[PDB]
Amino acid sequence: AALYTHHQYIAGFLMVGAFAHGAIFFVRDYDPELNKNNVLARMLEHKEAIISHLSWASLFLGFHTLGLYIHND
Amino acid sequence: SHTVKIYDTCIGCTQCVRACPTDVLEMVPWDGCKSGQIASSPRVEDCVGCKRCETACPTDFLSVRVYLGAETTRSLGLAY
Amino acid sequence: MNDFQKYLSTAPVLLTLWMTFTAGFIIEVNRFFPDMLGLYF
Amino acid sequence: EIGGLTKCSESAAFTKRLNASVKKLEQRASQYEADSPPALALKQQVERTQARFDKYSRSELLCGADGLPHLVADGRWSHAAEFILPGFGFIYISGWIGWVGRKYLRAVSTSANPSESEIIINVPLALKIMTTGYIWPISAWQELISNDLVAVSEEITVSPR
Amino acid sequence: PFPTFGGSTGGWLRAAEVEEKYAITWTSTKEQIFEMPTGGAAIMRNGENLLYLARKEQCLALSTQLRTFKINDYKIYRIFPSGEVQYLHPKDGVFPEKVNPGRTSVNSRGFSIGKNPNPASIKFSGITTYES
Amino acid sequence: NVQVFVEKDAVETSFAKWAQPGHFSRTLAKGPKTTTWIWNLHADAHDFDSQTSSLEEVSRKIFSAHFGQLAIIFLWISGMHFHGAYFSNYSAWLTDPISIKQSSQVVWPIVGQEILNADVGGNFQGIQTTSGWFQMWRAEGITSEVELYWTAIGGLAMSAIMLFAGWFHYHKAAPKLEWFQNAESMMNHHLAGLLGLGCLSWSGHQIHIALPINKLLDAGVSPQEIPLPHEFLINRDLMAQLYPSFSKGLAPFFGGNWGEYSDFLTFKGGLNPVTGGLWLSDIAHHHLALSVLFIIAGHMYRTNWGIGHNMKEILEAHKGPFTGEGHKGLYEILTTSWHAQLAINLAMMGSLSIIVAHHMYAMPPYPYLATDYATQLSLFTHHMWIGGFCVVGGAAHGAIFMVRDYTPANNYNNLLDRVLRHRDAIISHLNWVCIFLGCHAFGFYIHNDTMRALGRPQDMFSDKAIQLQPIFAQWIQNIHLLAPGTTAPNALATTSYAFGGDVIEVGGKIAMMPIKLGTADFMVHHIHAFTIHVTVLILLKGVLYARSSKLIPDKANLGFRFPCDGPGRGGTCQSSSWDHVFLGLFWMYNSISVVIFHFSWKMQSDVWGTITPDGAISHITGGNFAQSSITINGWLRDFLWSQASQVIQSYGSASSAYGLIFLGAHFIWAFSLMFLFSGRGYWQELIESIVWAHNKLNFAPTIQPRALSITQGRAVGLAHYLLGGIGTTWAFFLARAISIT
Amino acid sequence: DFLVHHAIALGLHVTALILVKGALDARGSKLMPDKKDFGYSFPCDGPGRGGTCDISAWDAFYLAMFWMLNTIG
Amino acid sequence: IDRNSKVRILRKESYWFNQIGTVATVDQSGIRYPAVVRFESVNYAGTNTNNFALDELVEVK
Ligand code: CLA
Ligand code: CLA
Ligand code: CLA
Ligand code: CLA
Ligand code: CLA
Ligand SMILES: CCCCCCCCCCCCCCCC(=O)OC[C@H](COP(=O)(O)OC[C@@H](O)CO)OC(=O)CCCCCCCCCCCCCCC
Ligand SMILES: CC1=C(C/C=C(\C)CCC[C@H](C)CCC[C@H](C)CCCC(C)C)C(=O)c2ccccc2C1=O
Ligand code: SF4
Ligand code: SF4
Ligand code: SF4
């Protein structure tokens, strides 16, 4: 139990760190002209679609999982 | 001390100057807009960083921008 | 009567009436057709 | 059967659950006189419990080791009454609601005061538009083909990248 | 020329003695009660008034309140422990909200806010994007 | 000259403004452009002084709204009486109050929820209710559901009357401001008329109706054989059979031989052994004496006849060498500011609710209340919560006064001015007191947890170790125990058995017995002192720094309620006095939670329980408070973990609603943390992406979606926090107490 | 196992949503179009424009730490 | 671009970027942002008007 919990919490910290340093890269290191029209720039170009669909998926999962738990309760 | 910059979209409405609690800003002559004046920040040593000036500014995007930086007694608003 | 009807047409009043009606029909459907764990009847 | 399960009409645990629930209800009922309203209410609860257990027995529902019905939602039609048909009903109803809401918002977008029509509903227009929800998929297809469903990117605001 | 004030615990501290102090003077045309920014009410004197404060913001809050009394001659100074004085406000004898010839623009950038350079383009230079 | 000044046909009655949401506000009247408008509309609805600058109009709105509140309260009371009349086992409970569980709510059979109709006894199924209706009705003399039906009908009539009165005094006959500024006459009427005549008439009901009916009911007479209430009025012989001094009549009252009425106006003290409640004759004497006191008090102030006191004169005279002008200016404040009056009155009403909670547990006033442990717990807890909210509201409205109605010119060198002039000293000393109390009181518990964990029980603060005896409280307890014969020589028993004396036993359950105070009680009382001091620190800082501070010298110009003054000066978030109310609310929640937990555990461990005819006492939790409540581990294990058993094991019984509400309250409490921990910048940015998706399909509201304001984010977070935490404690208490009662 | 797995997916999607929105809006948004000039971490942009608490990308990291902890839990 | 003309916004930092506003007036004095544009929706500051240069606007038909 201790080994599983230890490694899963460390994995969570590492994933959060990965995204934090991605954001730091975007602030400090990303140059729009060097990356013009590449995949990295096109992520920025459709960030609204990405974020809205991730929000839809999150809302769907939350609504239905919490609803099923509550119905059972 | 904080940094306060005026961009050339200023319409000389004098609202940031009236909003400032520590008298950082003043109106100066300028031919870039209809009102014939632009905002200026000659006294940034007294800027606390409250951003009331930005709240008062009517342009889109802002024409006055406060960038917070090195803290002093004056910028921290200390009475001690 | 026009003013009172416009008050009844406001968003909260209409939501209250509509949700009460919807809840009522869900309740009545479950009163006459209870315990539907799927469409098996 | 599927997933190493068994039909609830063949599950000993399911029938044990039915007997236990009925027994607790009847033990409660035994404390009152036969004609008391508590007794009649408890016996009606007993009948409803028996009817529910019987309805689940006659259905296609499968049961795990616990004696409770489990749902099969992998797409099989032999269990379509559990997720597929209710899902069809939900999609139809929710598409109706959403389509009529979008239609009303777009209709009042050109009124004298669009914002007022969002907080004070024009009830006649709303009821008229709500009655058109039943053909929402066909209307959606026609709106998609006629280029009225999807806007262009150049016409939608975005933030600096 | 101090206003009529019984004192408070909200006044200046050791900083006024060792770092810097502020003074506001003004002319009132009658004895009138006003709100001390440090808490409590004081009575202005007919004639010249002088008040000491710990912060410039306190002096400007008091001046904003004086404006509601139709008093516009207030002057605000900073005093250092050696006794040197700095005349602070209004700096040129004219309120900053009123445009004045002879003032030069300070800290203007001749473009809209959206034209500042990209951070990745000035790495290790020691500058910020808003200063370049 | 006290006169009635009323303007007639002040406001037209029409539905036009019902169709113009936000009509009351000049800004909100233009209609919405963003969803923020909607929230603002509800936030500013009853903020009358921001809707108009005339004090007379604010007074008129307040008066009519008060009538509306009275109509709502009458509707609520009438509904309770109607549910007692048609959905209760009150008649059956009357015959055997001990074994039948009170129930006045019934649920319909739908989706299986009928399981909530518990087997409460009396050929009746329903929800066990804990608001004390049956005990109150029995104390009043109510013996039939028809009397309850008539009380409910009258409640409906009064609700309609209040509603009409509100409409009439806003739209038809609106009093002038000079009418409202009649503090002297208002005090005279509310003391002599409202309180005095109310007490006198209630004493009349108790003497003539409630007393003989309860004497018969206690004597074992069936409710169906007790004479109807009017027979006691029309048959002086019926009363002479029960209380013989009624055969003398009113001759002793006007003759002055009041001692003759000693048979029904008593000073027994203690509790009635049959019911476990206060003697109704003591209560009647109490209300009669109180009526006299209030009628006297209502002749103090001068109105129209020369005699009487002027409040402004009295206030102006009370000043000393330490306080400058003293109380001068207070009369003007309290006759021109509704917020100042509301601050005082909320503080008083909340403190009174707390007092009510204490006094009602220790001297149970209704029959069969003391042994209805669920009702006792629920009443104590409910009144504690009401009091906490009202004291915090009084603080909030004091802050509002400081921001809006305080004028420097009218407060030169008076008490308010001098308090503002030494706010730094006040707040610094209160801060130090809070640190001292917190460190010592909570460090006792932390020390004990560490000592017990290290296997050093002899080093703990406890009765069996280093002792912290509350000797002052014990001294007071002894004094009160000795009072009945010596310092209150005409009292036959103690005011309350909690101070000492025998065990009062009703139906084999303990009604009240002495509540002994040791080291654990010392520690918990100092925790209470600590939490109250911190709550006072936050709220008093909010009032005293409402207008200005060294950080923000012009706070009053920013208003009562504003999120901040920007990230400058290091950061100024939550500097407004509204934010001080916001933080004080959390601290009040902490304080009241601890108080009600202390009550619950102490009563279960040392008071409530069973008692054999021999004399052996078995308490609900076996007397574990003394050795378990001195560590945090003991609270977590022996109180929360142990007593949560009922709420978490309630599924499949009539208590399952409590388990569900326990879970849902946990959920809402956790949901509040999203609002409390986050900020609106993130949410507005997310909403931008969602608005994009809607625009991508050719539709979007013209009422543009906005994340909640900073202040609304705080308000929502706190509201859900309080609902979640309080509702969790509510479900937990109710399941536990229904099991143990 | 089915219900708990959908709960886990909820946690993963919401944590990702917070982190991805923080990274993708690190450079700017409609509410703060010049966010890149202020750096990865900064308190806010003041109470103007409706209020701007927790607007930086660091604030997205801060919010996502709660969701990571809840998910790993 | 003239008064009453409908324009699409090209300024990226604008709340109304890619959206449509109406040109109320164009100053003819040589100011840096001469065209005043009104919009039907408010920005986050609650304003619905802004000044623009002519290369930040596109006529729409
Ligand atoms: C247990 C507490 C709790 C709950 C339920 C939520 C729920 C949510 N969070 Mg939050 N969050 C929390 C704590 C919580 N959070 C904490 C402590 C933090 C740290 C500050 C955050 C920080 C955070 C961030 C940064 C984000 C979220 C997001 C979300 C949404 C995720 C998608 C989803 O599941 O939609 C399903 C919806 C729910 C589960 C909530 C609805 C609950 C019930 C089912 C609705 C019932 C309505 C009822 C009938 C009406 C009221 C009745 C009466 C009053 C009238 C969801 C609403 C994200 C989001 O917005 O995604 C779209 C997002 O980006 N949260
Ligand atoms: C004091 C407050 C109060 C509360 C909380 C309750 C609560 C209850 N009553 Mg009681 N009751 C009360 C007072 C109260 N009552 C009074 C004063 C009377 C005398 C009239 C009664 C007489 C009474 C009877 C005879 C019965 C109840 C019953 C009930 C239960 C079911 C209620 C229900 O679902 O109806 C149905 C609910 C609705 C139809 C909801 C409609 C909501 C409307 C549409 C929204 C209103 C919003 C706004 C005002 C309108 C705006 C729009 C409008 C202008 C068009 C519930 C526990 C029932 C019961 O206990 O059964 C065993 C029952 O039979 N009550
Ligand atoms: C949200 C507010 C709220 C709610 C819902 C309740 C709910 C309840 N109260 Mg509580 N109460 C409250 C606030 C509230 N209270 C406050 C702020 C106080 C302090 C004054 C009280 C003092 C109080 C007393 C003394 C009693 C209750 C009782 C009750 C219960 C019976 C209701 C009833 O009709 O009794 C009707 C009330 C009585 C029959 C007794 C009233 C006696 C008081 C002294 C009358 C005071 C009236 C006076 C004019 C107020 C002005 C004060 C003055 C200084 C200006 C019910 C649980 C009763 C109870 O627990 O019964 C089992 C009960 O005896 N409450
Ligand atoms: C005598 C009682 C009383 C009265 C007459 C007032 C009156 C007022 N208050 Mg005050 N206040 C009070 C007690 C009172 N308060 C108490 C006890 C507190 C401590 C909580 C406060 C703390 C307070 C603050 C911090 C503020 C006020 C403000 C105001 C003013 C605006 C009211 C408004 O528009 O809200 C409209 C009413 C609502 C929006 C309803 C809110 C609903 C609440 C939040 C939740 C209800 C929960 C519900 C009971 C449970 C539902 C559960 C279910 C969903 C499951 C108004 C003058 C405001 C002001 O600016 O003053 C000038 C203000 O900022 N009050
Ligand atoms: C359990 C969590 C927790 C803890 C420990 C604290 C602690 C404190 N709060 Mg905080 N508070 C909390 C939750 C908590 N709060 C929450 C959730 C909120 C949001 C509502 C607040 C909002 C808030 C406000 C608005 C205020 C406080 C204040 C305080 C301080 C009160 C004065 C005091 O008693 O200091 C004494 C210290 C303690 C009681 C903590 C432990 C003491 C130990 C056990 C004994 C001494 C040990 C000693 C230092 C040796 C240490 C050894 C070490 C070197 C190894 C105290 C530090 C107030 C304050 O600062 O007043 C002066 C204040 O005004 N808090
Ligand atoms: C036990 C209850 C709580 C006790 C708290 C602290 C115990 C310490 C003893 C203090 C009691 C006596 C105070 C001075 C004696 C007193 O009662 O007043 C005596 C004196 C009254 O002066 P005058 O004779 O001028 O008064 C004329 C009056 O008409 C007022 O206008 O007050 C003062 O000298 C200033 C009062 C502030 C003095 C601050 C002392 C520290 C106060 C502690 C905080 C109090 C908490 C209570 C808040 C509700
Ligand atoms: C979650 C959250 C939000 C986002 C929450 C919002 C915008 C509330 C949304 C409320 C809804 C839209 C109103 C109620 C409607 C129902 C939820 C759905 C019904 C939909 C229609 C019928 C209207 C904030 O805006 C915020 C602001 C400041 C601090 C913390 C937070 C915060 O935590
Ligand atoms: S941030 Fe505040 S102090 Fe600085 S210039 Fe702007 S208004 Fe003045
Ligand atoms: S910076 Fe903004 S507020 Fe100041 S003068 Fe220019 S346009 Fe007006
Ligand atoms: S905007 Fe938010 S974070 Fe910034 S100072 Fe105001 S309250 Fe604090």
From TrEMBL, chain D:
Q: Does this UniProt record's set of keywords contain Nucleotide-binding?
A: no
Q: Which GO terms describe its biological process?
A: photosynthesis
Q: Does the keyword Methyltransferase apply?
A: no
Q: What does UniProt give as GO cellular component?
A: photosystem I reaction center
The protein's matches in Pfam families, at most eight in alphabetical order, are given as:
PSI_PsaF
Q: Which domain of life is it from?
A: Eukaryota
The UniProt keyword set, sorted, is: Chloroplast, Photosynthesis, Photosystem I, Plastid, Signal
Gene3D superfamilies, alphabetized: Photosystem I PsaF, reaction centre subunit III
Q: Which cysteines are joined by disulfide bonds?
A: 8-63
Q: What residues bind chlorophyll a, as annotated? A: 74
| PANTHER family documented for this protein | PHOTOSYSTEM I REACTION CENTER SUBUNIT III, CHLOROPLASTIC
Q: What does this protein do?
A: Participates in efficiency of electron transfer from plastocyanin to P700 (or cytochrome c553 in algae and cyanobacteria). This plastocyanin-docking protein contributes to the specific association of plastocyanin to PSI.
Q: Which family does it belong to?
A: Belongs to the PsaF family.
Name by which UniProt lists this protein: Photosystem I reaction center subunit III
From TrEMBL, chain E:
Role summary: PsaD can form complexes with ferredoxin and ferredoxin-oxidoreductase in photosystem I (PS I) reaction center.
Q: What is this protein called?
A: Photosystem I reaction center subunit II
Q: Indicate how the chain sits in the lipid bilayer.
A: Peripheral membrane protein
Q: Cite the PANTHER family for this sequence.
A: PHOTOSYSTEM I REACTION CENTER SUBUNIT II, CHLOROPLASTIC, PHOTOSYSTEM I REACTION CENTER SUBUNIT II-1, CHLOROPLASTIC-RELATED
Q: Which domain of life is it from?
A: Eukaryota
Q: Mind giving the lineage of the organism this protein is from?
A: Eukaryota, Sar, Stramenopiles, Ochrophyta, Bacillariophyta
Location(s), subcellular: Plastid, Chloroplast thylakoid membrane
Annotated Gene Ontology cellular components are:
chloroplast thylakoid membrane; photosystem I; photosystem I reaction center
**Source organism:** Thalassiosira pseudonana (Marine diatom)
Family membership, please give it: Belongs to the PsaD family.
Gene Ontology biological process terms from the UniProt entry: photosynthesis
Q: Which UniProt keywords apply?
A: Chloroplast, Photosynthesis, Photosystem I, Plastid, Thylakoid
Automatic annotation (TrEMBL), chain H:
Q: How does it sit in the membrane?
A: Peripheral membrane protein
Name where it's found.
Membrane
GO BP of this protein = photosynthesis
Q: Which Pfam families match?
A: PSI_PsaE (PF02427)
Q: Which Gene3D superfamilies match?
A: 2.30.30.50
**Chief site of localization:** membrane
Parts forming coiled coils:
none
Which keywords accompany this UniProt record? Chloroplast, Membrane, Photosynthesis, Photosystem I, Plastid
- State any GO CC term: photosystem I reaction center
Q: What does this protein do?
A: Stabilizes the interaction between PsaC and the PSI core, assists the docking of the ferredoxin to PSI and interacts with ferredoxin-NADP oxidoreductase.
What the record says about family reads: Belongs to the PsaE family.
PANTHER family attached to this UniProt entry: PHOTOSYSTEM I REACTION CENTER SUBUNIT IV A, CHLOROPLASTIC-RELATED, PHOTOSYSTEM I SUBUNIT IV
Query: Mind telling me what this protein is named?
Result: Photosystem I reaction center subunit IV
Q: Which gene encodes it?
A: psaE
